[PDB]
Structure formats: structure tokens, C-alpha cells
Write a protein that binds this ligand. Structure first.
Ligand SMILES: NC(=O)C1=CN([C@@H]2O[C@H](COP(=O)(O)OP(=O)(O)OC[C@H]3O[C@@H](n4cnc5c(N)ncnc54)[C@H](OP(=O)(O)O)[C@@H]3O)[C@@H](O)[C@H]2O)C=CC1
Ligand SMILES: NC(=O)C1=CN([C@@H]2O[C@H](COP(=O)(O)OP(=O)(O)OC[C@H]3O[C@@H](n4cnc5c(N)ncnc54)[C@H](OP(=O)(O)O)[C@@H]3O)[C@@H](O)[C@H]2O)C=CC1
Ligand SMILES: NC(=O)C1=CN([C@@H]2O[C@H](COP(=O)(O)OP(=O)(O)OC[C@H]3O[C@@H](n4cnc5c(N)ncnc54)[C@H](OP(=O)(O)O)[C@@H]3O)[C@@H](O)[C@H]2O)C=CC1
Ligand SMILES: NC(=O)C1=CN([C@@H]2O[C@H](COP(=O)(O)OP(=O)(O)OC[C@H]3O[C@@H](n4cnc5c(N)ncnc54)[C@H](OP(=O)(O)O)[C@@H]3O)[C@@H](O)[C@H]2O)C=CC1
Lengths: 334, 334, 334, 334
């Protein structure tokens, strides 16, 4: 229903396009990338991780045709030259990873767009929203350049919000055993992060994460109470968060799990999910929720230190949340 | 000079042999497996994880000849029929993974060996030892079936000791991101643990570990103070411990790091290591220590919550421990 | 209609089941393994390669329930004690990998079955059949212990048949760059084959194959004309046969490609397929045909030496042909 | 003795460096990249595939100090601004993959160098040399910009030369099951070759090669009698060539294998090795030789068709021939 555009047709760009296909409220009408329509059609149809797209994918001239609907293809590397206004696009998904500072992503608004959602942590964005945690603090008048946050922050927040509401977190650390991404190297090559410079499918690669910090942007009362690290491992997709927190109240594994299960059926249905099954990561590939509690891994020590473990498909769940935010923003009118 | 017999020439047994060649104090004279000498020489000679053995390996009759010395090869399924006496083996390394209970491991004693080291956590053993932490508590008169704990416990124990001795650990949670081992499956197949039943090279597989609780055997005062889990990921060797604990005292990163570094250069030299280089797991493949602190990852929240990260080559570090334990026992006079 | 029993609920055993679920002409009524119904149930439901089973899988005591249907779960490691005769089973799929010699597979007949399908190259079988190539030679009154050959032979026989009737093969050699299977080791371990004893997910492993001479069994015209090898590589599923051959006739890539495409659209429809898309292995995961020609890879040198590349999902394509042979055999009287 | 400069400090540039350290005739005095000295020295020091370099590496100013010798680090994205002449560099190793047209490679000569070796196949290069095959055609007067060929052409040419010399090649096809390289993609991303645009570690990926045809640039008699393709698999290093040739004379495996053994221990020692061991890829990681015949894989059909399989560590063997060629050039006069 609401016209949308995707700048940067990559892992997240193509996955948002795939998710958009089932949302009614929105309609992706144009996409921009650095490649031709034929490459774009191929990468869109066949995916190593997500499989063959189930739709009629074709190319007419330099315009994609998916299930009969024509999508316009651009190759304008400079975001102010896209002309979103010429084609009616109201929402633009910024997923190139290059325009995360508000002044750059703002170029889309220059080009005619009304709202810009950045699929990554940002700088000086008008607002940071994690669906299920603070979409409500959104104002159509004041927020135009919204950050959807990171995939890691999307997994953690929802169940950090419950844990906090319920038992209260005094402090905690998280580690995300995360699959590799396109920001890494196939074989030892230059990278600013000397660890990410190393062969991705060959080692456990410790790296930084600002996801633990970022959650304070959506859960202010958790400011200065969390921190953590990341460990990129040799799987192509699906990651897991392992949170160890000291709470204010005294609990047991059973009360902690009952709490998460309740939210998963209540307020966070669709965002937070609860699994009591002993699954592995390849089983979460295709998961649309942002966070699935591995109930079997919950642990308590001294009645005050919990260990919660959550799964998340960094591409599918996050892409879906981009679609959700898009459609939510659109419903608040613009 | 002390004759060593190895039962179960697999990953730990072969590596223990490899490590044994570097130490003259002991002499491996016998090895028991369930294949021919020819299959053993090849598997000993070519290692996918560690590379070719630097030494002459040959097959004479059905005994191995490594650097001219002939090693007796046995094919006794039943430990009771090994006759370690007939050939003078003094210490036996029990590395089959099948005889971790006193009932079975003791069969080696009844068969003529004086001491047995189980290269894994055991049941009803005379004593559980982690070198550098409590070997001093070994009693040559009272202890015959010795357990050398697990590779995880060996990693965490030596630094847990430091943090505790000098700071005080109220409570802690751990996660070891572990390479996969031969107890897993290449493709989905039957397994007691439905998690380790899944294709090892394809997923991040959460599983259990008694390592955390096993620290209490070697460090009695940390009984019931720490607990944890594991996450098997797609790498062939090298693992890492992630400990998150609450100290008695309020420290800083530098504070913690100073203590671990000091310990490694003095107290726990050769056992505990300290690294300030941003390395990846592959870099630790071949490392002989038990624990190398990834100093760039030490982290503190509030001054009370610490996160320390430590690398350990699960096969090489551990096997050099088995060799050091076997040399220490023998020094107490068999 | 026909009632089926599966002996060895392995990768092939469970994928044959998944395939059968869709077919009304057959009916899986019981499975045997070396584990409990709860383990089999979980393995049948979550697959690391093919994903979750879209059906209702549950347990009823010791029995499996799948979509309202009850499947008998046994755990008899000796075919002699299977009693298929008692439960009404007509066709038994022998997919353990341990009973491929008539002397062992015929036990199923003695146990009351009417036909046995060996899911691998057999010894002293009654007939080896490659659907599409020679199921026509199947005699219902004479053949009862049937071999469905190997996944590689099922890939190769279809197009070698076509090229041979079309231009006639004079001699050729093939290599199957194959995915690793459960017959290999995770990390270096004992194996009847020292190539296969090496860490599977770590190297390109040359190994032997009987698939190319086995072809002679279904197309005797090609006896002593073909030969070949295999190289197991680090992918969990999907393989590709590489055939280079000397032709009786001089041809063009374009002629060779036209023959193959015609056979796929006509005679060999559903077994031999043809593609002109620039695809990779992950793309053929789920494929039901036995052999898919990668036309872009087709080459010709001197108009006499050709090269033909074909894909095959070693688990799915092969699992579907077992079901196909099951229904064919059935229809011919049982 | 002869001062060398390396341009492009990548997998091939750093490996040539490791090689060069161990060669008395050459001396790398300078390297040019596109990143800071510290990033370069960490990449040189730790290698995920080859290990920790045994030599003291440090960064004195913007220069690298290796084993006491200071190496000049430049960061000129443009060849002619390199001033190789000022610092007295005679031979420049071109390993960026960007200056393969003799016109671009000539810019080094513009900048003061006397000779340029392109570590890849070139366009309009002066002479293409494969060590052991045609280094004798090098003319110190006529040749300035020289191509060392590709790792694949270096594996194929030496045994093709032997086969055609002893038996005579009527024609043949080849396939190099090759490891992935930096020109590939981590996860599905834009690429000129749609096969290479796919996740490198996840699939078997069929691609094209110039190798088989490029053989004629070293062995002209073989012009037109060869062609092949490539298949990159999920291994980080070490490749294998699989040639099936229709020979002129009727031979036996023993005869094909005897001729190869002779040359390996005679005329081509150092370049062609011969193995009768059942080895796998990981075993050739670090081989300096250009081609090792897997004697066990040698097979022949109809007395005229043969298949010979050869291993080659694509980074190390090739990096050792560049140094070799460099040293041979130095010997002929600069
Ligand atoms: N992968 C994941 O798990 C997640 C990633 N993200 C974030 O999303 C962003 C992109 O990541 P991801 O999709 O993973 O990576 P990709 O590299 O797969 O996607 C980035 C895309 O941007 C395209 N691109 C670059 N510049 C332009 C341009 N100027 N105009 C048009 N297209 C352009 C690139 O095209 P080309 O390839 O031609 O260079 C590429 O297709 C980053 O901010 C990342 O941190 C957030 C959550 C999850
Ligand atoms: N892998 C690692 O990183 C570490 C492992 N451990 C422990 O070490 C032990 C071995 O593990 P790992 O080395 O990985 O396993 P492996 O599976 O590689 O080796 C096990 C060996 O035991 C042999 N074996 C089994 N039964 C017998 C028997 N009855 N008589 C003689 N030989 C026998 C096997 O022969 P065959 O192969 O023919 O079946 C096999 O080589 C386990 O207890 C494990 O928990 C502890 C620390 C680290
Ligand atoms: N995988 C492939 O790509 C293909 C394999 N094949 C052939 O299929 C056959 C099966 O192979 P695959 O599916 O890969 O292997 P798996 O190991 O997964 O399956 C073998 C099944 O055999 C079971 N089994 C072993 N002994 C018994 C017994 N005595 N009684 C009951 N069940 C038993 C195993 O149980 P458990 O694991 O609990 O011990 C397992 O469930 C082999 O002949 C193989 O050559 C043919 C085409 C394709
Ligand atoms: N890899 C192998 O197995 C083999 C490769 N080759 C050939 O070697 C060449 C490079 O291969 P490989 O090492 O694999 O690739 P890499 O990408 O690892 O190396 C490319 C190197 O060149 C650098 N670079 C790029 N442009 C410039 C520039 N303008 N000035 C200075 N430095 C530059 C890159 O730096 P940066 O990373 O910061 O961009 C990088 O260090 C190619 O021609 C390849 O075909 C030949 C035999 C074997």
C-alpha cells in the first residue's frame, strides 16, 4: 500500500524485499544498487542461505518483474540523485551500510522521500526504534531518519525488557556467537578490525559489539548496566545471544522461563518467541521473530545471576522488523 | 625413562604421543587401539589439524617404529587383557573415552600398571588434578586412578584461581565456544544428546558442560559458585572460555589484567599465558599452555562484574598436561 | 496403497520417508533403527540440511504418529527378528548400509517381506535398477532382492545412456565431486579407507567409486568403457558428476546440449533435467530429479572428446527414486 | 643479492615474501600496499592458513623490520609513483591483480625497475614462463614484463610436458577442484561471474579457467589439444588438477606412473613430486613444489585414455616459483 524503496540491494536489501512480499501495508516500488537488473534478478532468485525465491522473477529492460509487478532499478551511487519523489516513494530503506550518519541518509529526503529507515546502528538519527520495545516513542512530525538498530540489539532488547520489568537487572554481560557477514574477509586481508581481517570460515573471531550499549537507546533504564562482546563463527547465518545478568530479585530457572514464555504469548507475540526444544542454529534459519528463548539453556546461580540464551536469524528476523517498522510508521500517517 | 602406555590412540592419545616425544623423562613404549599398526602409523604421521609428524614413522611386524624405537601395538578391546606388566608400562593414559569410571580404569592396575591417568572427567577416581592448581595434593601412596579433568576445566581453573585468590569470586557463569570433537556427528544421526546428534560442521550447537562445576574438585572453595554451558561451533580445533563473574572487590580492567599477566610470568608459567595481540582461534592451534588470556577482551561493568576470555587449544594444551602430569607422578617415585 | 517398512532410519532412511509422505501409491508403516521412538521422531522432524518436516510428528508410546498416521517403531538390529510378515509389510527399504550382500538382505524376505530394496550397490542381488535406464528388465517372479545402485550411478546412467544412443560413447572417465556422507570421520579417525579417515569438513578427499563400472550393470553396452574416481569435499549435501568421453561421432557443444535437453523434456522427464542457469551446489538442495545437466559447462574438443557436468542431490534425488522403484515394482504385482 | 620490490601485499605478495626470506639470491627491500605498516606486519606475522611466520617482525616508523632488515613501506595506488629506481630495486613482483596488461605492468619499468613479474596471467606480456618448462626461452634483452602464469597452469604444464614427451597427447580435458580465493564472495554479493557471486564456503561452485588453454603459451605443440574448467570448493587452500587425456601410444598405469616418477626424481625435481601415499588436501598445505602426482589416482581405460590427478598448494608452490623465476632472471643479467 505505501510505496517503499531500498537503497543497496544486498543481504539485508534482498531479504527485506522478500519479507515485503507478504506485507500488505507496504509495496517496494524501486531499488538502487551498483549492479544491473540481470545480476539483481539472479541474486534475488537464488540464495545460498534462504533458497530459491518462490515468485515469478524476471527482467524487462532494466526493470525487475516479480509476480507481474515491475520494480524500477537504479544504479545511482549518490543517494541525492535517485529521485524518490519522481516515483512516489515515501519510505526508503537505507541498507548499503554506507550512509548511517544522519547527514548522509538525509540525502533520500532531499531526493523526495518522506521517511528513511537505516538498517543499522546510526549517528544523529532522529530516533532509534526496536519493535516491541519502543515503537511507541515514534512521532511522525519529528522523526524522519529512524534507525532500526542492529540485529543483535533487536534480539537482546525484547528479553532484556522483560527481565528488567520483572526481576530488575543490576548489571550483566552478553556475548553473541554470531555468524559471519559480508563485512569480513574470505582470506586474510586488510580490514580496520585486525580480527575481522582474518579468514571468516576458519576461526572463532572475537570482535566488538555496541549492541549491549545500544539497548539503552530503547531501554533508557538499562544505561550503563550492560556490555558485551561478539564472537563471529563459521556459520553463514543465524546467531545467538548469551546474556548473564545479576538481578535485583531472587529467582529460579522456572520463574525466569515462565516470565519469558508469558511475554512471548502476550505483549511480544511475533518478536519474542519461546522454545523448549533442543534445536541448533541451522533450525532457526528462516525465523521471522527477533528473539527465541532457548528455554533449555536458562540457568540461575545464587538465586541472583541468570543466564538466558536466545536465537536469532540475523537476516530474516531483522529484515522482517524493517518491514514491520516501515508499515508501523506508515500507519501513523505521512 | 618411566614407561608410559596409551590406551585409545585417538585425538588425545596420538597427540599425547606427539607431546611425549618432546619430553625425555617418560618413554611411550606401548599403545592400544582397535586397528592395525599400518592404520595407526598413517594416522600418527598425517594430521589434518596439526600436520605431518616431524619424525620417522614405520611399521615393523605390527609394532610402530618411530625414530628407530619400536613401540608395541595392541588390539585389546577388553582392558583386563592388556598385560601392561609383561611389557613394563608404569603409567597408563586412559584416552578411549570408554573407561571413565573407576571400575573400568582400575582394570589397568589389576593388569600390571602402577598409575592410571584418565584423560577426561571420571567417576570414583582417587583424585582429580589440574596442573598448576592442585597437583601438590597428589598422594603417591593413596592415589592411583587419577583424572586429568577436561580441556575446559583445565582452561578455566588456572585463571579462576587467580581471580579468586586475589579478588574473590562471589559467583560466575561461563561459556566455552568449542570446536567440534569426534563425539559429534558429520550428519544428523543418533546421539544421547539430541544437540550433538546434529551435523557438527553446519551449526552452532549449545550443549552441556560439567567443567564449571568440575572446578570445585580442584578449587574446593569455588564449590557451587560457578556454572555454565558449551557451544560447539564449526572449527576443527581450538576453543575459548568466556567467564563472567562478580568479584568481592571493585576492580578495573587494568587491575584484573595486571594480576593475570603477573601470574603467567611467574606463578602459573607454562600453564597460564597472557596475550595483548588481537588474534583468532587459528593462531592458537599448536599452543601448549592450558589457558591464554585474551587481554583485549577483559571487561568490567560497575567494578564488580568481570568478563575474561581465554584461548585453549583443546587437543595440544590438554595433551601436554597429560605428559606433565605423567612426569610429575613419576617424580614422586612410582 | 503398498505398505513399506524402512530398515535404518538414516539420512537415506528418513529422506525416503519424507519423499514417501507425498506419495499415496505407497505407505510407510514401520521403521527400524537402533534408538527410541523419541529420538527418531526428533530426527525426522528437524533436518540440518533439508529443514523441518511440514507434517504432524509425535510419539504414541513407542510408535510414531505422522499426520494422523501410526508408524511402527522397532529397534531390532537383526533383520531375522523383524516380522514384517506379521505387520503386513510388502516392500522393505534396506538402508542401513550393513546388509548389502544378498545373504544379509534376503533375511527380510525370510522375515515375511515380499521384496527388498537395497539403497546402495549390492552383492549377489537379483537386479540392480536405475529408474529411467532399465526398470524395464524387472521380472516380478524372479527378482526380489533389488539394488537401486548408488546416487552417483543414478546421476551418470541417464545422460551416459542418452549420449551413447545418440552418438555412442567409446570410452570416458568421470569424477564425482561429492558431498561428505556419514561414512566419513569428523576428525582423523580409523577407517577401512585411509582417505575417508581424515577430517571431512577440512579437506578435498580423493576416494574410489564403483559407480562408473556399475553403470555397465544397467547399460551392458558400456561394459569396460568407463571408469573413475571421487573427491569428497566440505559440503553437507549435493554432488556433481564430471564426465569426459571419446565419441563415436563428431559433435558440437550445441548438438550434445540439444540431445540432453530433448531427452529431459521427453523420455527421461522427471529423472534427467537440463539447466542453462549459472547455478551452484546449494541451489540443487531439494532437487527430486536424479541428474541435472549444467549446459553452460558443456564442452567439446576436436569434436570428439566431450565434457558433461551434471548435478544431483545425493539424498533427495536418490530418496525419490527408491520411492519410484517402490511404486513401479508394486504396480507390477506383489 | 638482487633487490626486489613486491607490489600488492596479499595472499600471493606476503607468501612470496615468506618464500624470499629463505632464498640467498634475492632480497626484498621494499613492498607497496594500500594500508598502514602495522596492518601489514600483523598480516605478515599471523596467517590463518600458513601459521605464525618464524622470524622477528616489527614496525619501525612506517617501515617493517624483518630479522633485523628494514623494509620500505610505500602506499602508492599508482605504479609509476613508486620510484623503484631510487631505492635500487631491479625486479618488481606485481601481485595486485590490477596491472596485468603489459601497459600497466610497464609503469614499474617507468618508475625505475629493470624487470617485472606478473603473479598472474597477463595480456600482451613479453614472455609467459612456467618454471621447469620454458625458463630457457627467457631472453634478458627482449623480455622485461614477464608473466609466471596461474597456479593451475603451473600444476598442469610440468606433467603435461612429461606425458606428451613420453606418450604424446592427442587431446584431453581438465578440471581443477580448487580452493576459494579472495576474488570470491563471503555471502551472495555482486560479482561479474554469477557463480563467484555465491557464498564461497557453502557451495561447490563451477567456474571457468584459462589454465588448460594457457598451457600452449609454454608448450606450443599442445596448442588446441586442451581445455577445462574449474570448481572452487569450501577449502581455504590447496588445489587439485584432474586431467583425462587421450594418449597417442597405448600405455598402462605402471607405465604412466613410471615416467612421472622418473621425471620427478630427475629432470623436474623440485617442481614435480611423486606420491604413493593415500593423502588428502591438508597434507599439501605448505608444499613448495608446483605439482605432486597422486600415483594412487592414476588410471587408464582402453589402453589409450588416462586420468592423472595432481596436487598443488596454490599459495605456497606458486609463491616459490615466483622467487625461483626472480632468481633465474637475476642469474641471466640485469
Ligand atoms: N547481514 C546481517 O546479518 C545484517 C546486516 N545489517 C546492516 O545492513 C547493512 C548492509 O549489510 P548487508 O546487507 O549485511 O551487506 P551487503 O554488502 O550484502 O549489502 C550492502 C549492499 O550495499 C550495496 N551498495 C553499496 N553502495 C551502494 C550504493 N552507493 N548504491 C547502491 N547500492 C550500494 C552493495 O552493493 P555491491 O555489493 O554492488 O557493492 C551491497 O549490495 C550494514 O549496515 C549492516 O551492518 C544489519 C542487520 C543484519
Ligand atoms: N578431543 C579433545 O579435544 C579432548 C578429548 N578429551 C577426552 O579424551 C578422550 C578421547 O577423546 P578423543 O581423543 O577426542 O576421541 P577419539 O575418538 O579420537 O579417540 C578415541 C579412541 O579410543 C579408541 N578406542 C575405543 N574403545 C577402545 C577400546 N575398547 N580399546 C582400545 N581402543 C579403543 C578408538 O578406536 P577407534 O577409532 O577404531 O573406534 C579411538 O581412536 C575422551 O574421554 C574425551 O572426552 C579430553 C580433552 C580434550
Ligand atoms: N547419504 C547419501 O548420500 C547416500 C547413501 N546411500 C547408501 O544408503 C545406505 C545408508 O546410508 P546413509 O543414509 O548415508 O547413512 P546413515 O548412517 O545415516 O544411516 C544408516 C542408518 O543405519 C542404521 N543402522 C545401522 N545398523 C543398524 C542395525 N543393525 N539395525 C537398524 N538400524 C541400523 C543407523 O543407525 P545409527 O546411526 O543410530 O547407528 C542409521 O540410522 C548406505 O548403503 C549408503 O551407501 C545411497 C545413496 C545416498
Ligand atoms: N590466491 C592464489 O591462490 C593465487 C593468486 N594468483 C594471482 O595473484 C594476484 C593476487 O592474488 P591474491 O593474493 O590471491 O589476492 P589478494 O586480494 O589477497 O591480494 C591483492 C593485494 O593487492 C592489493 N592492492 C590492490 N590494488 C593495489 C594498488 N593499486 N596498489 C597497491 N596494492 C594494491 C590488495 O590490497 P587490499 O587488501 O587492502 O585491497 C591486496 O593486498 C592475482 O593476479 C591472482 O590471480 C596467482 C596464483 C595463486
Amino acid at each position: 500500500a505505501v510505496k517503499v524503496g531500498i537503497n543497496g540491494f544486498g543481504r539485508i536489501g534482498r531479504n527485506v524485499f522478500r519479507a515485503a512480499l507478504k506485507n500488505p501495508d507496504i509495496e517496494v516500488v524501486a531499488v538502487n544498487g551498483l549492479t544491473d537488473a540481470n545480476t539483481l534478478a539472479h541474486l534475488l532468485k537464488y540464495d545460498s542461505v534462504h533458497g530459491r525465491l518462490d515468485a515469478e522473477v524476471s527482467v524487462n529492460g532494466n526493470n525487475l518483474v516479480v509476480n507481474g509487478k515491475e520494480i524500477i532499478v537504479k544504479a545511482e551511487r549518490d543517494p541525492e540523485n535517485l529521485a524518490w519523489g519522481e516515483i512516489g516513494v515515501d519510505i526508503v530503506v537505507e541498507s548499503t551500510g554506507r550512509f548511517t550518519k544522519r547527514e548522509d541518509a538525509a540525502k533520500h529526503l532531499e531526493a523526495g522521500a518522506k521517511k528513511v529507515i537505516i538498517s543499522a546502528p546510526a549517528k544523529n538519527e532522529d530516533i532509534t526504534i526496536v519493535m516491541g520495545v519502543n515503537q511507541d516513542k515514534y512521532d511522525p512530525k519529528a522523526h524522519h531518519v529512524i534507525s532500526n538498530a542492529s540485529c543483535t540489539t533487536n534480539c537482546l532488547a525484547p528479553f532484556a525488557k522483560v527481565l528488567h520489568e520483572q526481576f530488575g537487572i543490576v548489571r550483566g554481560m552478553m556475548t553473541t556467537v554470531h555468524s559471519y557477514t559480508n563485512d569480513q574477509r574470505i582470506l586474510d586481508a586488510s580490514h580496520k578490525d585486525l580480527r575481522r581481517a582474518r579468514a571468516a570460515a576458519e576461526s572463532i573471531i572475537p570482535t566488538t559489539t555496541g549492541a549491549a550499549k545500544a539497548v539503552a537507546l530503547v531501554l533508557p533504564e538499562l544505561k550503563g548496566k550492560l556490555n558485551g562482546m561478539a564472537m563471529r563463527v563459521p556459520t553463514p547465518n543465524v546467531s545467538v545471544v548469551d546474556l548473564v545478568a545479576e538481578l535485583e530479585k531472587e529467582v529460579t530457572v522456572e520463574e525466569v522461563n515462565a516470565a519469558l514464555k508469558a511475554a512471548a504469548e502476550g505483549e511480544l507475540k511475533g518478536i519474542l518467541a519461546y522454545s523448549e526444544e533442543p534445536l541448533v542454529s541451522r533450525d532457526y534459519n528462516g525465523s521471522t521473530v527477533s528473539s527465541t528463548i532457548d528455554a533449555l539453556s536458562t540457568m540461575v546461580i545464587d538465586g541472583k545471576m541468570v543466564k538466558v540464551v536466545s536465537w536469532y536469524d540475523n537476516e530474516t528476523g531483522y529484515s522482517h522488523r524493517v518491514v514491520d517498522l516501515a508499515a508501523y510508521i506508515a500507519s501513523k500517517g505521512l
